[PDB]
Design a protein around this ligand. Sequence first.
Ligand SMILES: [Zn+2]
Ligand SMILES: [Zn+2]
Ligand SMILES: [Zn+2]
Lengths: 186, 97, 209, 174, 107, 116
Amino acid sequence: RPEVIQSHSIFEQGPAEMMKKKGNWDKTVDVSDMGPSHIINIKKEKRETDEETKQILRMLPKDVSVAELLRELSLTKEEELLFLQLPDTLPGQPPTQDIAENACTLADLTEGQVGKLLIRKSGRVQLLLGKVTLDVTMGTACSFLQELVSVGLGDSRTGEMTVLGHVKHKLVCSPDFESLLDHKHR
Amino acid sequence: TEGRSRDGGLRLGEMERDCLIGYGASMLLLERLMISSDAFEVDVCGQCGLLGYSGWCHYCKSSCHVSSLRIPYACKLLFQELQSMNIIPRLKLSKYN
Amino acid sequence: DDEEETYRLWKIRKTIMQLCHDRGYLVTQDELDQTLEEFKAQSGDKPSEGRPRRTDLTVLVAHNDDPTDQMFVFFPEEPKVGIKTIKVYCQRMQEENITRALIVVQQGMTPSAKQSLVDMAPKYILEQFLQQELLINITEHELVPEHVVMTKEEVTELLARYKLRENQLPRIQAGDPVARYFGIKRGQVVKIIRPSETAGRYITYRLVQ
Amino acid sequence: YMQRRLVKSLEDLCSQYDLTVRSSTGDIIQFIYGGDGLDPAAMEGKDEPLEFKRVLDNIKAVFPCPSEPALSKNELILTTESIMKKSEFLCCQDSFLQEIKKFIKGVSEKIKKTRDKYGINDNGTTEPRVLYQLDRITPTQVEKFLETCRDKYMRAQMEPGSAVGALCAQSIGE
Amino acid sequence: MLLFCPGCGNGLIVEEGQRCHRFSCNTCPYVHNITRKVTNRKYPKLKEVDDVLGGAAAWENVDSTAESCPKCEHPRAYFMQLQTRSADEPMTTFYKCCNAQCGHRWR
Amino acid sequence: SGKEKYKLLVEGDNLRAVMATHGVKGTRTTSNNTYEVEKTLGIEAARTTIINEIQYTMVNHGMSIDRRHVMLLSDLMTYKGEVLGITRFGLAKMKESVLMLASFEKTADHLFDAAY
Ligand SMILES: [Zn+2]
Ligand SMILES: [Zn+2]
Ligand SMILES: [Zn+2]
C-alpha cells in the first residue's frame, strides 16, 4: 500500500461531493418486477419502536382524557372500546350475597346505570359513582395489539371463540383522597 | 517483657535503628540491640559451621576449630529453630585483620 | 505529503552524517551542513528519487584506524524487512568484503530477522535503527550528556587510579540508545561529562554490560 | 512505609576514605560524593559551600587595621595571586580556586569603579582621607579572608565513614 | 439497525439470495427481499471549533456587499456559520470584530 | 513582558513519537515518566529526569532538599544500567541477602528455596 499520500490546496465543490455520493448508491436493480422480487406491503419487518414500525415506505405527544373523549364523541360517531382499571373496592354493598365489609367488585353489582361520568371544564374528568367522585386519568398508553375476545363454552367439550374488536386506549380510575380527607379530617 | 504492668521496658523500633544508623554510631547500636537486650556466648566450630559448647564441637568430635563469638539470643533461637526445620545455617567464620 | 517525506529523508541523512562523524568515520564537511534546499539537488520527490538504492552510503571509512575498515548505511524499502532482504544485504556485503553495516528500517523488523542479526556472524555485524528514532539527534539533547568512548590505555589508568577491577564500575546496557548510537560493544568504558549547576564539570564512567 | 523501603535500600552505602561511595559488595555508586565531595550539613550558602560576600564583610568587620593602606585593583590582584600560589592551596579543588579568583576580580572591579567615581589616586595622598574608607580592603584582611575560605572548604568536605545513604533516606522521607 | 421478524420476533440477519440480498430470520421461514435503497445514518459528534477559530484562522465566508458589524459600522469583521454538533443541527451564526484599538466578541 | 512563546503540554506516554513529529523541537523536550526517558534517551537522561522530577515535587510543597541527596538517590537507582525500583524486586536485584528478604514478606518459600 503506498503510504506517502499526496494532498492539494484546492477546495472541494459541494455539489461535486453530493453528485458523487448520489452516483454511488442511487443505482437501482428494481427492474425485476417479479414474484420473488415483489414484496408484501402489510408484512414489513418491525422497526423496534412499535409506534415507528415503518422503516421502509411507499414514498408523538400524549393525549389527555378530555381530548380522547372529545375525539371519540365529536370527531367520529363510531363506537370504540376502552379498557379501564378500577380501584379495589367500590363504594357499595353486596346485595343479599351472604356478606364482613369485603371487596365490592363489579361482580357483586347489578345491571343498570351505575354512575355518571362528569367531564369538568379544563381537563378535569371525574367519575361520579354515587356521592363520592372517583378520578379518571390516562394510563400508560399501549401500542401493541390488544384484541377483546369472547369465549363461550356452550357445549361441555367445545365452544365458541369470538373477537369483539381491538382495544386501543387504557383508562385508570383512582379515588380522590384529597376530597375524602377534606370531608372529615383525621 | 511488653507493657508497663509487667515492668516491661521500651522498644527500639524499626525507625530508631535507622536514626542510629544515620549518625554512624556503630557501637551504640551494637550495645542497644545486643548487650542491653540479650547477650549470649556461643561456640561456633570453624570447620563444620555448626554451633558447639564449652570449646567442643560435638559433630566433628574435636576442639581444634571452635571459636568464642558474642551473639544475640534471638539469633541463636533463630538458628536452632532453623536446624529443627532441616534448614541448616553453617556459619563460616573468617577472621579479623 | 512529499514535503514531509523529503523532510524525513533529509533529517535521517543529517543524523547519519553526525553519527558517522561521532564514530570516527570520515565525513565530508558539506554533508554536515546540508540544507534542505541543497538536498533538493541530488535527491528529489517520490517518483524520481528512490530510497533503497539511491540514498545509500558506503563511502564512510575509519580514517583513524585503516581505510579498508568501512561501514554501510542502507535504507531498506519495505516496512517489515524480510529475512531474504537481510541475505541480499549480507551477500552484497560478503562480495564487497566489509564487516560493518547499518540498517535504517522504516517500521521495524520481523523477529526472525532480528534473531538472524544476532547469529549471522561475529564478523558480520549489522545495526537495526528505526527511522523514528533517528529523526532527532539524541546526542544534541539537553538531557543526554556528552559521552566519549575511552581508549584501553586510559581505561587502564582509570582502573589504576581508583584501584578497581573492571566489574566494579557502574554499568550501561548494550541495548541502551546512546550505546546503540556510539556503536560500542561489551567491555568498553565510556566517559560521561555531566553538566553542573555551577560552571564546573563532573566526570563519571560506565562499563558496557 | 516509603521511608522503610528507602532505608532498606540505601543503608549499606558509605563514603570510603578515597572519597568514593561504594555499595555493600564494592561496586561504585559515585566516584565522588555528589560531584564535589561536600556535606549537605555544612552548606553556608544556597547549596554551595560558602557565600563569599558575607565572609568578606565578616573579615572587614572583625579585623579592621586602621594603620594599613587600602589596596588598589592591581595590588589586590597581585597580592591575591601571591597568596593563592602557596603550598596549602594545592589541597583544594580547581573549581574552588576559580570561584575565589572570580570573586576577587569582582571586588577589584568594585574598587576601580568607586575610585573612578570619586577621583581617588592610588598613591594614598588625596586630602579628604575619608574617601579611603569607601571600598577599603587591606592585605591583612586578604590573608585572613583566604585562610578563612580555605578552612571552611576543608572542614566542609564529606567526612569518610558517614552513613550517607541513611541520610538520603531520612532527608527524603521527612 | 435491529429489525425483527413479524412472525417470531427473533433478530434478522442480512444474507444474499438468488435474485436479491435478503433480510432473513434464522429460526422461521420469513425473508424480506431488499428491493430498494435503505439506509441508517449515525451522525456522530464532531470536534469543538471554539479554539480553532480564535486567533486569525483561515476563514473565507466574507463576500462582496457584506454587512458591516453593528458596533463599529465598518466591514472590518469576519463572520461564519458552522454546525457545533452533528450536521442535523441548524447552523448557528456568529461574528467577531477586530479593528485598531477595538477588540470585541459577538454572537 | 519581553517575549511570548507557546509551549505544548502533552498528556501522553509515547515520548519517541512526540519527539519525531515535524515542528516540535526534539532537542529540548522532557517527560515525567522516567521509564519512557530510559527507553528513549538512555540511562543517563533517566538519571537526570529522576533528579529534576524529585526536586520539582519537593519545591512545589515548599520543602527544600539539598541536591546531593536526590543526586545520590538517582545514582543508586541507575548504577546497574537499568532503572530499578525500591520495591522488593529491585531490592532483590540490589541486595543479595536472604534474611533481609525473609523479614519482608513471603512466609517460608524464600527460606526453603535458599536451603535448597
Ligand atoms: Zn565441627
Ligand atoms: Zn422470524
Ligand atoms: Zn473591528
